[PDB]
């Protein structure tokens, strides 16, 4: 429903695989594939 | 023969006779289209006579009495008449050939119809659109292929090479097409099909191989596409199978043809393309043209032509099958006169049922209208029965050898002879391990340039008789300048183009050489489809020693080193003498070569010149403005000593200056028209300055040389040492392209200004610096070092910032993901459109094109990829695709036009906040002085929880909330 697309997108997990088969089809010739993968906010990333 | 066999053959003879033979003029041997259309087509001509040239081979393999051979010569000579009637028809516009021959308009192009009672003409040349490349190049393959079987002036023979030099640039010409109406929105708009380009190329190899290539090259890109403006066309049939067989990709032909059938096959035939409308029930009958709205209306009820499945039983015969299912579909003949099948043009939807036609795809009962018998299908429907019913071989028709194009060709082994163009220069390669023979050791054989093989070729078809002049001078590509030729009986072996062609930077740095020659064997394996085997001419010149001179270069050494190892550049190399290699070479011979501040006064100003060389170069470019050919007062002019300090930096070879110099002096690459032209010649967009977007002129077709390069100099407005730029990476893209072409896929608008400023970046962040010293350094490149940047930046190759680094080398070679395209098609069907920096892209181009044109992905991506900065482009990329992501679960559509940025954007502001609460720096999140997104929502990923993709779809959702108020959503 339209709410949860905007709230979080990724835990409803119909839409997230079609998040990440998108983040592929647009991304995967850079490609453990995580790089195409956020799950960190830069923060927690740029902690150490 | 005539106990079972004779019957039947005289049984074909009275169709024929009945369909075809029967309207035949008796003064001009041409064939009226129908009794409404009293003129004689040059491509339903050639056509029809196919039925009486099977007949009369059919009649001749059993001519043994008189009355058999008198029926055999009767066919055969009625199809000479034809042929020769066609030929006076072209013959009297000998005007328009030798005009078409160097300025390809369609204003000056052949006459289609003609006048079937004089072989004069009817219409004007205004009058109907008459640039049909096909029509022209299937008469030259059946002249072929009929004389190669033994149907028989050299002033005709003249005007047959001036045709071949006419449809010889058809890679490269837009046409009115096989339907001669060029374009589907029927404007006549003049446009590319790869039918004509297809016969054009199976003309050329039945009666030079470089433009042949060059289809051969067009037609790989283009299929299983028609052209800019079709996705498919059913005349494909026509290049892909009988009669061109202009396609060697097996895979490439049987996906046409599955195309052609599961887009355009119907219960009637197939339609010749979607969305025709030729006699469609919505057209207006009177109106000449088509409105781009009234496209869609002739969806799914275009009229289906019979004609295109006596191509599918043609195949099937040619190529062995049980196609029997495409005879025994062909029951919708008209009578059953007496029991003539009378093939029909077209089948129509009737007029009521449209409704239903368009729900319900191909379930109608269709009524026949158009031509009966359509004279084309009736003769193609004669002969598949022949050839089907054994009284004809595939290889009677086609004499050839056409059809054995599909067969893998093995690769072929280039045999390459390293010259010495002094002695001296023998004795280092020697010493070094290269045993070579000197250009004066190989006399008799005399070595020469490329520009002399192509001004010889300017004096084949000549004949001032008729005012025909020889063949336009055309750059003779690797292909070409690698057979040997008999010249005056002394053979004359020509050096590559790349070669002979010393006036830009290029040809100083030696390993640019070395990469052109491998280019060109990684050309000339694929692309040899010739006789003999073919063979370069390698000289070693006094500028590929290295600086000292005792010593040659260490490229130009390792590559002959590699050569001489049999493998270089993607190719089997056989080196050695080039007398030993007369014996097994493509040695053609040329018969028609046989006689037979203040101070604004600039009195004493470049005094400050009499060592940095740099120095001395600036003032030049102030004395060059102000003051190029103007005179300095010590016997000297400012061209001259800028030529002076070009010598002299290309001497010291630092490569910042050589450029500069060579910006402000004009410098222009030669082969570069043939650069764009390889460039565009497989289906991609060249776009050539800066890129916001008026600078960044587009090129969407061909262009002379002096128009590209002025195109090119208005694309920099003034700001030197990019124009140069442009040229150099359209002359890698084009070699690349002859290369490696996969590393071209998913792209199809090569921005050149946002590639140059890619190639910053990367010297700015690999060998890391300031973008600007970068942007500076990258003058100082090498040409090989700068094309190795290149590959790097295509391949994406590397010598927590990298998603930054990504979204740009994508965007700005303008990189766009598999079905990208059609997914944009199928948004536009739910939106009212998409909206780029304020650029609309409408749902009314969905009316007038089918998904998978190639035109409806030029309005994508000059709405779209215009974009100046490279990722922003790439983040509306995925905006785009979050959008048709989401348009699929949406189960409802708005009425508004979405505005892309804004997704992103708003994507930009749920950046904020959220990354802010995650808890980081405020200065860790920075704008883009460009483009106002954070730097950090670049380096995000596309996926995860706060990965970017993820908050288009968290944007495009609180985007669409209060266009859409209710969402009842999958
Ligand atoms: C169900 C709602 C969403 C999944 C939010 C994202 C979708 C849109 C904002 C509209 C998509 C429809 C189009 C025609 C683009």
Request: charged share 35%.
């Given at each position: 429903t339209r709410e949860i697309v905007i709230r979080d997108p990724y835990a409803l997990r119909p839409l997230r695989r079609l998040i990440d088969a998108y983040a592929f089809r647009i991304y995967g010739h850079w490609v453990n594939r995580a790089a195409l993968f956020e799950n960190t906010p830069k923060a927690v990333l740029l902690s150490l | 023969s005539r106990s079972n066999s004779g019957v039947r053959l005289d049984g074909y003879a009275r169709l024929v006779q009945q369909t075809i033979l029967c309207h035949?003029?008796?003064?001009?041997g041409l064939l009226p289209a129908s009794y409404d259309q009293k003129d004689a087509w040059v491509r339903d001509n050639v056509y029809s006579i196919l039925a009486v040239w099977g007949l009369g081979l059919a009649y001749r393999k059993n001519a043994d009495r008189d009355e058999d051979k008198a029926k055999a010569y009767e066919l055969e000579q009625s199809v000479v008449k034809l042929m020769r009637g066609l030929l006076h028809c072209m013959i009297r516009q000998v005007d328009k050939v030798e005009s078409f021959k160097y300025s390809q308009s369609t204003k000056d192009s052949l006459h289609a119809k003609y006048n079937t009672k004089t072989c004069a003409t009817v219409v004007g040349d205004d009058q109907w659109g008459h640039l049909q490349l096909d029509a022209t190049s299937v008469y030259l393959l059946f002249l072929a292929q009929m004389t190669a079987s033994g149907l028989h002036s050299l002033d005709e023979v003249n005007f047959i090479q001036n045709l071949v030099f006419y449809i010889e640039?058809?890679?490269?010409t837009a046409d009115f097409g096989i339907w001669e109406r060029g374009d589907k929105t029927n404007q006549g708009i003049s446009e590319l099909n790869a039918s004509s380009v297809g016969m054009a190329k199976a003309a050329l190899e039945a009666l030079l191989a470089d433009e042949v290539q060059h289809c051969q090259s067009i037609l790989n890109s283009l299929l299983p596409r028609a052209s800019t403006s079709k996705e498919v066309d059913a005349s494909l049939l026509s290049v892909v199978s009988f009669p061109a067989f202009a396609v060697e990709d097996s895979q490439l032909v049987e996906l046409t043809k599955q195309e052609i059938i599961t887009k355009l096959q119907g219960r009637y035939g197939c339609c010749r393309?979607?969305?025709?409308?030729?006699?469609?029930?919505?057209?207006?009958?009177?109106?000449?043209y088509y409105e781009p709205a009234e496209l869609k209306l002739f969806e799914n009820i275009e009229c289906e032509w019979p004609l295109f499945w006596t191509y599918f039983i043609l195949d099937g015969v040619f190529s062995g099958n049980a196609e029997q299912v495409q005879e025994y579909k062909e029951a919708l003949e008209a009578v059953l006169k007496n029991g003539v099948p009378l093939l029909p043009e077209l089948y129509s939807v009737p007029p009521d049922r449209v409704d239903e036609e368009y729900q319900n795809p191909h379930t109608v009962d269709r009524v026949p209208m158009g031509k009966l018998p359509h004279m084309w299908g009736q003769s193609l429907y004669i002969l598949g029965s022949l050839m089907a019913e054994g009284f004809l071989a595939p290889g009677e028709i086609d004499p050839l050898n056409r059809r054995f194009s599909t067969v893998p060709k093995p690769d072929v082994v280039v045999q390459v002879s390293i010259l010495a163009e002094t002695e001296e220069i023998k004795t280092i390669l020697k010493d070094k391990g290269i045993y070579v023979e000197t250009i004066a050791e190989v006399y008799p054989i005399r070595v020469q340039p490329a520009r002399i093989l192509s001004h010889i070729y300017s004096s084949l078809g000549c004949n001032n008789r008729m005012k025909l002049s020889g063949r336009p001078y055309r750059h003779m590509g690797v292909l070409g300048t690698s057979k040997l030729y008999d010249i005056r009986k002394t053979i004359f072996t020509f050096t590559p183009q790349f070669i002979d062609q010393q006036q830009f930077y290029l040809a100083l740095d030696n390993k640019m050489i070395v990469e052109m020659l491998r280019t060109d064997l990684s050309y000339l394996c694929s692309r040899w489809r010739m006789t003999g085997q073919p063979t370069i001419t390698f000289p070693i010149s006094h500028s590929m020693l290295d600086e000292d001179g005792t010593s040659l270069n260490s490229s130009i050494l390792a590559a002959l080193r590699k050569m001489q190892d049999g493998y270089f550049g993607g190719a089997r190399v056989q080196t050695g003498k080039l007398s030993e290699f007369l014996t097994t070479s493509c040695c053609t011979h040329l018969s028609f070569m046989d006689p037979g501040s203040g101070e604004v006064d600039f009195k004493a100003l470049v005094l400050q010149l009499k060592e940095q060389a740099d120095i001395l170069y600036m003032l030049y470019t102030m004395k060059g403005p102000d003051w190029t050919e103007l005179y300095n007062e010590r016997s000297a002019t400012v061209r001259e000593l800028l030529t002076e300090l070009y010598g002299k930096v290309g001497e010291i070879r630092h490569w910042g200056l050589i450029r500069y110099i060579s910006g402000i002096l004009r410098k222009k690459v030669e082969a570069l028209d043939e650069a764009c032209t390889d460039l565009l010649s497989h289906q991609k967009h060249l776009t050539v300055g800066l890129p916001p977007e008026p600078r960044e002129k587009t090129i969407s077709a061909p262009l002379p040389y002096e128009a590209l390069t002025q195109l090119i100099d208005e694309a920099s407005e003034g700001d030197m040492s990019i124009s140069i730029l442009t040229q150099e990476i359209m002359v890698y893209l084009a070699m690349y392209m002859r290369t490696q072409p996969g590393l071209f896929?998913?792209?199809?608008?090569?921005?050149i200004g946002l590639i140059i400023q890619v190639m910053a970046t990367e010297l700015a962040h690999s060998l890391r610096c300031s973008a600007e010293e970068a942007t500076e350094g990258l003058m100082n490149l090498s040409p090989s070092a700068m094309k190795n940047l290149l590959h790097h930046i295509l391949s994406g190759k590397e010598f927590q910032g990298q998603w930054q680094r990504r979204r740009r080398l994508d965007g700005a070679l303008n990189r766009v993901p598999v079905g990208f395209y059609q997914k944009v098609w199928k948004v536009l069907q739910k939106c009212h459109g998409l909206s780029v920096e304020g650029f609309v892209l409408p749902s009314s181009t969905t009316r007038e094109m089918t998904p998978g044109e190639i035109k409806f992905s030029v309005h994508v991506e000059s709405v779209l990829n215009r974009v100046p900065q490279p990722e922003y482009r790439q983040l509306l990329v995925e905006a785009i695709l979050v959008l048709t992501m989401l348009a699929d679960i949406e189960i409802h559509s708005i009425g508004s036009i979405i505005a892309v940025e804004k997704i992103v954007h708003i994507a930009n502001d749920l950046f904020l906040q959220e990354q802010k609460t995650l808890g980081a720096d405020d200065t860790m999140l920075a704008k883009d002085p460009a483009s106002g997104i954070c730097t950090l929502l670049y380096d995000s990923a596309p996926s995860g929880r706060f990965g970017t993709m993820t908050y288009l779809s968290k944007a495009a959702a609180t985007y669409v909330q209060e266009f859409l108020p209710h969402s009842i959503c999958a």
């Open positions: - | 035949q003029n008796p003064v001009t640039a058809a890679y490269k393309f979607l969305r025709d409308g030729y006699k469609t029930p919505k057209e207006d009958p009177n109106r000449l896929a998913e792209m199809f608008r090569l921005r």
